[PDB]
């Protein structure tokens, strides 16, 4: 006598509460460590609330082989005694035909695509719907926590960036569309992350940043071509072309866009990130603190160049997180 009619995930209101409204108003995007509200609808009125509450449990799974050991599968009841710092569910408001349920996730939860399943004593599992779990720069217990609201708005919510190019004495700001909230960017980022098989480490921003940074550098090496060709429309078309092979390729004169693409994928996953430009960067030294430049008697250079050169500028991605595996004091950028 506890058959479910439908489940409303309330994607608009939850996405507004979770700083995810720019992603969608129909798909549920939630940040780890923060409660979100769903409405459960019953086919028939529920006579006695307490036994019915005793008869139901909720399950959250992520990935293709969810397991309790991987922290990719969690089973929790619906009660006021649930651990709000872990997976939990409590009925906040109820009527005879519906339950308003507040669901929490741990601040160290594995990110990615999740399924919510309901188990009603003496019945088979029922899929309530899908949601995507992200890092939470707004939760004090998250590793990507940011102190300031203004820094949160700038390093995660802003799609309108500025990549600084030019020389040290003549800096030209180029408008850049990061587009982290574009519809497919989250799916593309999670698909790229799925090339890493240590899904249990996807709770760690450090591991996620390192895997995506390496994969994106590999893609940049594979897809950027030797030398309109320089017309750019932001990070999202570049990411689409790098992952799918379709679209306008990027040429080697604009290889600095790797930093912007990495910034876009990190920000879409919820890791605070910024593009930094260093002017007069000595690249290709291997740690050596010397640069050899060779000029002819006319003050000109003959060949294509050395391996160790001083670049006019170089772009880089900086990301915000704690460093639990490092000695104390290295949290931040």
């Amino acid at each position: 006598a506890l058959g479910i009619k439908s489940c409303d995930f309330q994607a608009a209101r939850n996405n507004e509460e979770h700083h995810t409204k720019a992603l969608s108003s129909r798909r549920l995007f939630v940040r780890r460590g923060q409660p979100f509200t769903i409405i459960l609808y019953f086919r028939a009125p529920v006579r006695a609330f307490l036994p019915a509450l005793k008869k139901v449990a909720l399950t959250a799974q992520t990935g293709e082989q969810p397991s309790k050991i991987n922290r990719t599968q969690a089973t929790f009841p619906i009660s006021s005694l649930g651990d709000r710092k872990w997976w939990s569910a409590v009925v906040e408001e109820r009527d005879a035909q519906s339950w308003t349920i507040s669901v929490t996730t741990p601040a160290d939860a594995v990110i990615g695509h999740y399924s919510l399943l309901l188990q009603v004593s003496g019945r088979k599992q029922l899929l309530l719907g899908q949601f995507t779990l992200l890092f939470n720069p707004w939760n004090r217990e998250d590793a990507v926590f940011l102190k300031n609201e203004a820094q949160r708005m700038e390093y995660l919510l802003n799609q309108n960036g500025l990549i600084y190019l030019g020389t040290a004495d003549c800096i030209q700001a180029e408008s850049w569309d990061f587009g982290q909230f574009e519809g497919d960017v989250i799916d593309l980022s999670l698909r790229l992350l799925s090339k890493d098989k240590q899904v249990e480490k996807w709770s760690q921003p450090v591991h996620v940043a390192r895997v995506l940074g390496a994969l994106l550098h590999f893609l940049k090496e594979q897809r950027v071509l030797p030398t309109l060709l320089n017309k750019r429309r932001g990070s999202v078309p570049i990411l689409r072309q790098w992952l799918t092979g379709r679209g306008r390729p990027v040429y080697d004169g604009q290889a600095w866009v790797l930093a912007a693409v990495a910034c876009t994928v990190l920000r879409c996953l919820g890791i605070p990130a910024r593009v930094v430009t260093t002017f007069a960067s000595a690249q290709g030294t291997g740690g050596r603190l010397l640069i050899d430049e060779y000029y002819n008697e006319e003050g000109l250079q003959n060949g294509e160049g050395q391996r160790g050169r001083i670049w006019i500028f170089q772009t880089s991605t900086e990301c915000w997180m704690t460093r639990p595996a490092l000695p104390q004091g290295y949290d931040g950028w």
């Binding site: 969608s24 108003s25 129909r26 798909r27 519809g183």
Partner: protein, 145 residues
């Protein structure tokens, strides 16, 4: 004068709608200050419950057809044609995946190449209509494969 469908069918909903169903709003109007008829086709990035036009389901597609009075242009019948086009499975799939106008016109030419015209034929109505069944069945053999 009244529409033909009103005179033939009207002189004498939520249960029938599937759950993951979106809406198409076909807007049809006559504006005498326009030089030519205009078609506006909109696919939203995501389905949306527009407050101005409440529908049983979320809207993904808008057909806007406006223009002046012209010969052979019944705007009601043009809206009926656009709605019938959207109700067809192959065109609707092509419309969800279309990235340009050219793909949408290549779907519309396929629909017209699988469209069958019955001329005025003095046979009794039942036999004349039921003769379309094998012709339609053969014509749509490859369209839905």
């Amino acid at each position: 004068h009244s529409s033909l469908e009103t005179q033939l069918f009207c002189e004498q909903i939520l249960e029938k709608i599937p759950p993951d169903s979106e809406a198409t709003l076909v807007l049809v109007g006559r504006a005498d200050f326009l030089e030519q008829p205009v078609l506006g086709f909109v696919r939203l990035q995501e389905a949306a419950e527009l407050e101005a036009v409440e529908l049983p389901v979320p809207i993904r597609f808008l057909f806007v057809l406006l223009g002046p009075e012209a010969p052979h242009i019944d705007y009601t019948q043009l809206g009926r044609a656009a709605a019938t086009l959207m109700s067809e499975r192959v065109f609707r799939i092509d419309a969800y995946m279309a990235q340009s106008r050219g793909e949408l016109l290549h779907s519309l030419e396929g629909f017209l190449d699988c469209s069958l015209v019955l001329p005025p034929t003095d046979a009794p109505s039942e036999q004349a209509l039921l003769s379309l069944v094998p012709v339609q069945r053969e014509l749509l053999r490859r369209r839905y494969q």
